Design a protein around this ligand. Sequence first.
Ligand SMILES: Nc1nc2ncc([C@H](O)[C@H](O)CO)nc2c(=O)[nH]1
Ligand SMILES: Nc1nc2ncc([C@H](O)[C@H](O)CO)nc2c(=O)[nH]1
Ligand SMILES: Nc1nc2ncc([C@H](O)[C@H](O)CO)nc2c(=O)[nH]1
Ligand SMILES: Nc1nc2ncc([C@H](O)[C@H](O)CO)nc2c(=O)[nH]1
Ligand SMILES: Nc1nc2ncc([C@H](O)[C@H](O)CO)nc2c(=O)[nH]1
Ligand SMILES: Nc1nc2ncc([C@H](O)[C@H](O)CO)nc2c(=O)[nH]1
Ligand SMILES: Nc1nc2ncc([C@H](O)[C@H](O)CO)nc2c(=O)[nH]1
Ligand SMILES: Nc1nc2ncc([C@H](O)[C@H](O)CO)nc2c(=O)[nH]1
Lengths: 121, 121, 121, 121, 121, 121, 121, 121
Amino acid sequence: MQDTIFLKGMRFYGYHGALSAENEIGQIFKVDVTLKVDLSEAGRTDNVIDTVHYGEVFEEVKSIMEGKAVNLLEHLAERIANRINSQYNRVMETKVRITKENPPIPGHYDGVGIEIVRENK
Amino acid sequence: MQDTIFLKGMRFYGYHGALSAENEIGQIFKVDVTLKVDLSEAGRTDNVIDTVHYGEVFEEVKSIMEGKAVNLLEHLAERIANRINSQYNRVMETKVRITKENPPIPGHYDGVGIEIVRENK
Amino acid sequence: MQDTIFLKGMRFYGYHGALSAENEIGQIFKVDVTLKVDLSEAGRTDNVIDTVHYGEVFEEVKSIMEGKAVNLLEHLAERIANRINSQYNRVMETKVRITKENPPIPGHYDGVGIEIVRENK
Amino acid sequence: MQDTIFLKGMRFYGYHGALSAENEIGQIFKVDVTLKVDLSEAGRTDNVIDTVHYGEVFEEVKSIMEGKAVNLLEHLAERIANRINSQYNRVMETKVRITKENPPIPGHYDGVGIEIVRENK
Amino acid sequence: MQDTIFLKGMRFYGYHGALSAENEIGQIFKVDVTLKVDLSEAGRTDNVIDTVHYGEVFEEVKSIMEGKAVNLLEHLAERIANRINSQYNRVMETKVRITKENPPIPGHYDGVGIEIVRENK
Amino acid sequence: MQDTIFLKGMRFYGYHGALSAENEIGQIFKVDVTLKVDLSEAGRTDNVIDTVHYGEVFEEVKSIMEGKAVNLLEHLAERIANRINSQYNRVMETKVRITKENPPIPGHYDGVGIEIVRENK
Amino acid sequence: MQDTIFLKGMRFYGYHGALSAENEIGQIFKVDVTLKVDLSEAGRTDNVIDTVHYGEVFEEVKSIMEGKAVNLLEHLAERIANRINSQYNRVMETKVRITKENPPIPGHYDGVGIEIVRENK
Amino acid sequence: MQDTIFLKGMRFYGYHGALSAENEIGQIFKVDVTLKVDLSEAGRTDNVIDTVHYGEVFEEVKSIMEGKAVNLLEHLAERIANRINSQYNRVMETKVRITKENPPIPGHYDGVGIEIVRENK
Ligand SMILES: Nc1nc2ncc([C@H](O)[C@H](O)CO)nc2c(=O)[nH]1
Ligand SMILES: Nc1nc2ncc([C@H](O)[C@H](O)CO)nc2c(=O)[nH]1
Ligand SMILES: Nc1nc2ncc([C@H](O)[C@H](O)CO)nc2c(=O)[nH]1
Ligand SMILES: Nc1nc2ncc([C@H](O)[C@H](O)CO)nc2c(=O)[nH]1
Ligand SMILES: Nc1nc2ncc([C@H](O)[C@H](O)CO)nc2c(=O)[nH]1
Ligand SMILES: Nc1nc2ncc([C@H](O)[C@H](O)CO)nc2c(=O)[nH]1
Ligand SMILES: Nc1nc2ncc([C@H](O)[C@H](O)CO)nc2c(=O)[nH]1
Ligand SMILES: Nc1nc2ncc([C@H](O)[C@H](O)CO)nc2c(=O)[nH]1
């Protein structure tokens, strides 16, 4: 069982951050979300009723990302994860990756971030 | 058995999609096909009859994206997932992935779609 | 526990390397640090005291690449692997990766180095 | 146990291929090789005697790649895998990926190929 | 006077296009506008009033692309042009480049667009 | 009149080339295009009839590239340049470029290629 | 004399910007450089003393960018352009560009930035 | 006569450089040479003799870069220039661009190089 619905590279502009200036200025927020769903039925039938619309999942990711400001990425991801696993019983697991290639971190890197993995129960 | 034969970034211009305008104007679909098959024999000998003509697989995956339009991308994955599984029993596992960097969805993101993993029967 | 906190592409100009000319002219090292840590609490609350200041981690990984030169890249990984492991017990697993796209080696290739995975003790 | 020595993106010019014109014209051959080695000792000491020189591994990959022409990628990979696992008892597993983004395959794709995984016994 | 102020890579998702289908689906548009200004005083004095706030420049392009639906990229760039030309006595010329990466044309390409060069009177 | 209608990176899998082998293998041909079209009232009205529909231009470049094989890129660019020149009085000057990223050449490069610039007569 | 000594994409983590916040957060500043240097006998002899050592130029651009904060990019490009102009008679003309890929601007773009071109007097 | 024949992205690993250290380690060099030729007849006739074999052009650059050790990029480009200028009465100008992506300068940048433009007499 390893089928996966993916939303990779979703980049939004959020004012989240533990800093004060961040929650002022904001910055692009990269978010990758893969959902453990089985597309054997979806694949057999070819009907939505057999899977998760990646457009709806997009918007849910969207609601949380540009929603109120948070402090950590853990917040934003734990909120997407529970918005995804509590909206679709079709999604066994929902891992959320959020990168910030624009932090107030003096240096050169392709970005910092976190990446959670939540199943449903 | 952790071996694989892959084909990535296969770009096909299909008129698939749920909406009427999509199949009306069409767009690019980016297929990534990964087949899981023992390569020991093939590498030991060195004759395609021991492996799977990945060039063939293209035409097989390609006869599904330039083929008949449809709704769900999972379909397009299933159609390719099945066609490749069937015509080759040596293929233990089949990974068909299809991306749409350009679906009609207000927003910036690098691409979306679904991924499915199939085994041989 | 499949959660993580990452930092990728950290570029540091260190004079490390086995050869004498390397530490003589130096080159770019590309560190990718992935820490495995529960983010549920952090995301549940939303306060760094519940997670790991990844900005801190930079300065920690960075105090190893701009620090004292050495021979083996594995060293540089170990030094960072240890420093981060120690100063944070919340860090279950630590992944330090260091790439050298420019080592003195006749040939075309995009980059090389090693990767090591550490757990907390 | 998940430390890994990596050589990613090594691109060579080989005349390998099952075609006749290929074995005539040749084409760039991409090769990724990750070696299951434990860098805990290497990391603790900081001495070569504790790991595999990625330069030697490079050359071995190099010998096979520009060596005599072969037919499949299975050949080239199975030969690198057994050149790596029979030269270093320090390498538990050796997976070899070889991409050919230049095959005689009428279409658009980011390349075709295989990817083997061999342990040592 | 080769000094310039630019906004390369501006991406907006509009419903522009001479075909109703594209007027329904919409698509990511990409624009680059490079202003011909004299950054002499701004350079010594360091007073933004001695230059053109590009962020305010981004607005005038955002309002146009994020605005109503239109037919040609030419017009999209037409209002861009004067919109800035009329608002800032600071800029001598407005160079607008508009790209449609995924137009309603069947094929494989970078993108398609136009670039107009308008000064001030 | 610096204006233009550009069609970047059109990639066609052609069987052209000076090598009889190449014509059996095939390879992608990346084409750049830049027709100088006075887009004054094209933007004025917003009626494509007052300008060149690149799409048609694309399909015309396509008929060339997917046509039967020739040896030089120069003949290809010319059969293309000729096509446009003899279809759009709108086009003051045509500009074709046909890069070669996979020709039979033992070496490392991003490609080789010719570029021509023809006007109307 | 079209010659030049160019220094592309120099990235410095500066605390500059017109926003008091920015100066606390910090951000990368990407700098482009292109000094017009008559490299006639520079290539003739092969004595760098008969030309400009870009390295020095780099470290001189560095002293600027890693210096204390200012508000405009224009002052930065000027403190840089001034530096070169007043150090190398070799340089007939200087050319600075300081892109901004992470400024406080709710929008999607590859960056914004000014570019100046100064000569010697 | 804006027609051109080019070799953009030529990568060679030499031991060039004015510092003995770089003369010991070596480094990937990148060169682009765009020839000013008239592809008129080549275009209609399609006879390679009516043009300049770029593959033979790649040779003359390979021999120079893969050749002896030198001091300045200027010279590396100096022999490139005439080497082609003298060998082909077909080309009017040889435009050589040489880049050193990872020079012996401490910092973060794209690359450093020079570009000379020489015609024929
Ligand atoms: N998970 C998580 N960790 C963080 N650590 C530090 C900072 C600070 O704002 C700065 O980046 C450090 O300069 N923000 C975050 C954050 O949002 N999420
Ligand atoms: N899971 C899943 N969700 C989808 N959501 C929207 C669309 C639409 O056809 C377009 O991509 C966007 O308008 N296709 C799919 C799909 O195949 N699979
Ligand atoms: N495993 C391993 N192999 C290595 N081989 C060569 C070099 C050299 O310092 C240079 O990169 C190349 O000359 N460093 C290393 C290294 O750290 N780890
Ligand atoms: N594993 C493996 N499979 C292959 N399948 C087909 C071809 C043919 O030469 C062409 O690519 C098909 O056009 N070559 C190979 C190959 O070298 N390795
Ligand atoms: N030169 C030029 N050609 C064009 N072709 C088509 C369209 C349409 O709006 C849509 O892109 C596709 O029908 N706009 C233009 C245009 O503005 N300029
Ligand atoms: N200027 C120019 N030079 C060329 N040289 C070789 C080849 C052929 O594809 C093969 O490399 C040799 O058979 N084509 C061309 C070409 O179109 N233009
Ligand atoms: N031309 C030009 N415009 C600018 N606008 C805003 C800012 C500041 O960094 C912040 O965006 C606003 O505080 N800097 C500049 C600048 O250097 N140059
Ligand atoms: N303008 C110009 N500057 C240079 N600076 C340094 C070097 C040296 O060979 C090495 O790159 C570093 O010492 N070559 C050159 C050069 O040819 N041209």
